[PDB]
Amino acid sequence: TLMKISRGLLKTILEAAKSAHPDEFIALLSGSKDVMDELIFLPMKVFGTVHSHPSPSCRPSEEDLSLFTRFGKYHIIVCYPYDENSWKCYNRKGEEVELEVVE
Ligand SMILES: [Zn+2]
């Protein structure tokens, strides 16, 4: 039904963002059916993208708006301090999307 993201994937994303800090982390999202459970690193179906911001804001940047139009329908933004409440998901049009974590 409605797309959800696995807890493990979320955790790996937050850890990768923290490790990239102060630089931005960027990667592709994927999975099977209705669960995001694949992380694809940059040098198959693509659900979307994920990238971080070294500051406390998850608001899409001008560039992000351009990124959202190319890879998948779900685009996650993770921001400092990269805890479980520092990310948001957006769709190709930059609108906010509700992405629940699997039990
Ligand atoms: Zn950005």
Residue numbers in the entry: -1 to 41, 60 to 119
The authors write:
The JAMM (JAB1/MPN/Mov34 metalloenzyme) motif in Rpn11 and Csn5 underlies isopeptidase activities intrinsic to the proteasome and signalosome, respectively.
The zinc-binding site is adjacent to a loop that spans the end of β4 to the beginning of α2 and is stabilized by a disulfide bond between C74 from this loop to C95 on β5. The two AfJAMM subunits in the asymmetric unit are connected through a parallel β sheet formed at the dimer interface. The latter hydrogen-bonds to the sidechain of E22 on β2. Nonetheless, the active site metal and ligand atoms of thermolysin and ScNP can be superimposed on those of AfJAMM with an RMS deviation of approximately 0.4–0.5 Å. Meanwhile, the γ-hydroxyl group of the highly conserved S77 in AfJAMM occupies a position similar to Nɛ2 of H231 in thermolysin.
